[PDB]
Amino acid sequence: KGKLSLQDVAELIRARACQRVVVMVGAGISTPSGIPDFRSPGSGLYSNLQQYDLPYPEAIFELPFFFHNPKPFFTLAKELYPGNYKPNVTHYFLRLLHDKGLLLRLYTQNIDGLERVSGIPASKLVEAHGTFASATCTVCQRPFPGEDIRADVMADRVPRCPVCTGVVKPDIVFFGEPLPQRFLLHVVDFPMADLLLILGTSLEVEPFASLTEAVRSSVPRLLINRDLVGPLAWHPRSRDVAQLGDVVHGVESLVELLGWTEEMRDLVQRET
Amino acid sequence: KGKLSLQDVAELIRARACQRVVVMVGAGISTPSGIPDFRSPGSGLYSNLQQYDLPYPEAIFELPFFFHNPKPFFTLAKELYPGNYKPNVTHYFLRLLHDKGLLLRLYTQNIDGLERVSGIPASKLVEAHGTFASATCTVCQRPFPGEDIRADVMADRVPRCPVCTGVVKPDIVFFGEPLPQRFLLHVVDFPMADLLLILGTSLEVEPFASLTEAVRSSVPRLLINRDLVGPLAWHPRSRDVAQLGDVVHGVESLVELLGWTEEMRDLVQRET
Amino acid sequence: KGKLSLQDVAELIRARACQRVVVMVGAGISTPSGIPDFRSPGSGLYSNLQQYDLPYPEAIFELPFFFHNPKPFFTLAKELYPGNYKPNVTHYFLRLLHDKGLLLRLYTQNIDGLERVSGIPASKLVEAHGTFASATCTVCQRPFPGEDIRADVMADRVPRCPVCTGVVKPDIVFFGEPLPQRFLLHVVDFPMADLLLILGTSLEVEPFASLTEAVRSSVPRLLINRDLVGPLAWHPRSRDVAQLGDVVHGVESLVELLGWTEEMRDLVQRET
Amino acid sequence: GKLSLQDVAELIRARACQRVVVMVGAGISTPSGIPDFRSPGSGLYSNLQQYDLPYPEAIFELPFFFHNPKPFFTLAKELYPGNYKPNVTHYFLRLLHDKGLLLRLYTQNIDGLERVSGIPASKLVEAHGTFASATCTVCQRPFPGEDIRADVMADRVPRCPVCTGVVKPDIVFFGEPLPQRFLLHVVDFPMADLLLILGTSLEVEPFASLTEAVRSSVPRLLINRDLVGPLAWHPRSRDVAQLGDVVHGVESLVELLGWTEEMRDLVQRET
């Protein structure tokens, strides 16, 4: 019936009737910046991690495993460390969401840091999987210096804090660590949201997929990702719209439906 | 003075101060149903997994060992398939937590499926080590309901894919496979818990065992198990309680202090 | 018919058919002399190390932890340096095979030093986890007799070179150090041995646990432990003999089944 | 009449020594370019420390190998057959076998160069195993070491019967049952009339212990950068010690044997 297309969605934001946007982003926004992804067979990182004959492929994120075997995690680290990559039209669009005062929160499962590198502030972010921007000693459990354990990460060396080696670990959240207290914000963010935008994520690894259903039944869910997936696939609602297809072309056709094409082109030029 | 024992944890639940309870369970709640447990000797499943000389007991969850000889795995699978065994009091106790609206989520290392038989619904469950409810071809990767396979598995026959002849395996987690998609619901579940209950597990198979340290620091952690194990034995917290002894006996004393002895008897009778 | 019982074994030693007994012992032969154990739930030295924050009980043998806080490790040694505890029937029973000329070699995971104290010379021993006999500094690597650094451990100091003025340390094997030089004497011992005797050991830490299979398949394999463990639980041979029960009584029966009871009583008296 | 290198060379020339037992170590492979993981600041040593292993020899530990096989295959890559050639120490041992004087050559190297030098397998105890043979850890199917050599830039897992899993070169691991061929030592050493200890530290047993197994009348010649093991701690009256660079030492002894020109044509023809 009176259903929603991307046209309908753009003029909700133009008519500023949607002004509290909660955005969920996964790897479908960072693959077009050159980011390998460790869960894609045929990635240079997948093959080199596949080589580690690990138990589960995600043990690289497990603290007790890390204490006896740190080098696989650090194989992923230099593939994804900050300073080698650039944000794209996806990251910078979300910066425009913020600037125009429309962003409630950006939930990311990426760890490249290009949400913050694009100018979105820390207070608008939930970096669900942590950051490479700070690091801690595993022994003397204090440090911080972010890039600092860098160069070690370039040079295939396991970084060490000046007083107990200590395999100083980038602040990627590991199984067995206390989890981010900021993740508790989902409790109040997902009710408040007058709009759920799902960008370039397979809604495959929890809690991300469950969260798409925390939003009020009146709230629309717009999916810009190759294929409908997760609850949008299985439990769709009346206001669910999806631009199945390439994320980048996806965000440009939505950006051209808002009229931000120029602001963008300007911002990607200014920023870069 | 007012520190924490078995009475106090019952007092909190009856008073509904605890209403978001998170539970972890392992093998010790499956042994009282007569389940063999393949790891301790003197089990018939030992003398029967001796017809196949192996290096590890674990080697039965290793894809390359499966890729000659599925027979050691499939004699574990014949002994454990849904049918033979019946949920015991501890199961039904958990089912009563969900009946009375106290179960946030049940995390299990078991693969017998007696949490599902006891009537706890699937949405309440994270099956850490997979399930026999479903099957996928090792070559095709085509999915299969598990009863397509129970004819063959209940015949000392190796089930083959009808589309490509590849050997089909139950969706029991194997070394090298990505961890269950639902294991990450703990990011949301455990900081939301106001009580953590641990029943019948050694807390030695991670990432499962590290989940003990993901409830907030004030939240009590009740252990019902023979001995102190895992993070509860090296990082004990103030509000932890260790009811040490036979697993069934521990729960019976908790039900009595809860005052559920008749409601349990009844439910258990009607369910068997 | 002629399958092997603790009786049978004691006849081959009396008949001098087994004249090359290699022997493996672990913390289970040490315990009955009062040894506290660093990894047992609720003991003297266990709560000591637990007083500090360690993520592992095994971090005391971890070298970057020794460069942060060494006072854990040393207040273990302060409760294991020789003199404090006295050898028992197990130490002296292995003292008597040597005396009677039957011992090829004693292999031991123990560090309390009691095998030496019992009258077994250094060349009969292979000390897998090191010894409190010699010392060494942790910068220059200068050698020090154990007394040298024994003065200071009992003086609660942290012992330091005149060179580095840096913390010296007992030659207890630490993670990242190379395994004792004597460990590879097994390449000649075990194939030369006609009896393998395994005492009070969980057989859980490699490369110690692997020695069990280094004997020729002809060689009787005998375990005095509380329960059937390690490679004798999963890979038993035609000639393995399991005396399950307390280690001290298992020796005391065999000591009677060899009829050295009078010898043991007088060897012990004289040594005390 | 107390022994020096000229006299040992003389005992060989007269065939007064015809049953030579030889023990060799990483010092006869380092002149070929083979790194050596034990030697601090080598190539291997630094990359292996990137794996924070529980002890450095863990790379030959069999249950460690079923978890991270990488640190071992990291050693295998810089040691694998087909990157190096036998140097002059090998051909000198090959000249000793061709002259009918070698009783047995005992080696702790796994680089295979003794065999490439032409020494018969029957004169060889490879006390650490070999890379000429590889075994699937799951099905025990044998492979030529050259089957997996291509992968020896990451990690090998062939197909076979009970396989699809990690194929392990036959380096002897703690956990694998130890070489039956090594029992030859019980008779070779009591019967040697000369012991050549070439280019080994006697750091890793049983070799250090085996220097004592020759009869007290049998000279022990060490050609090695330094005095090591029971020769330093328990010297006998008939030990000679050519300390300094193994290749110079061997070339020196070859001069005293009158063999410099036969080694010429040999090394030349073999390379």
Ligand SMILES: COC(=O)c1c(N)n(Cc2ccc(F)cc2)c2nc3ccccc3nc12
């Ligand atoms: C970019 O991926 C990451 O950094 C991940 C990461 N850090 N954990 C562990 C983790 C996340 C959140 C938490 F609260 C505690 C522990 C992950 N688990 C995964 C499980 C399945 C599939 C993909 C996964 N990816 C990650």
Ligand SMILES: COC(=O)c1c(N)n(Cc2ccc(F)cc2)c2nc3ccccc3nc12
């Ligand atoms: C009935 O137990 C099961 O179903 C098991 C199962 N599926 N795996 C394999 C596995 C678990 C977690 C992972 F991340 C990857 C692969 C197991 N490993 C074990 C290891 C030691 C002791 C018991 C074990 N039990 C199981």
Ligand SMILES: COC(=O)c1c(N)n(Cc2ccc(F)cc2)c2nc3ccccc3nc12
């Ligand atoms: C009192 O026992 C000891 O002296 C130990 C000792 N010295 N390490 C360190 C070690 C490092 C490398 C290596 F190859 C052998 C040993 C230990 N690890 C243990 C780990 C788990 C459980 C008990 C352990 N016990 C010891």
Ligand SMILES: COC(=O)c1c(N)n(Cc2ccc(F)cc2)c2nc3ccccc3nc12
């Ligand atoms: C190139 O060195 C190797 O290949 C080694 C190797 N294969 N083992 C293990 C081993 C040898 C013989 C046996 F009968 C059973 C197991 C080693 N252990 C060492 C211990 C200390 C220092 C160096 C060592 N090196 C090796």
Ligand SMILES: [Mg+2]
């Ligand atoms: Mg730091």
Ligand SMILES: [Mg+2]
């Ligand atoms: Mg001093």
Ligand SMILES: [Mg+2]
């Ligand atoms: Mg093959």
Ligand SMILES: [Zn+2]
């Ligand atoms: Zn530190």
Ligand SMILES: [Zn+2]
């Ligand atoms: Zn198939």
Ligand SMILES: [Zn+2]
């Ligand atoms: Zn010093």
Ligand SMILES: [Zn+2]
């Ligand atoms: Zn294979």
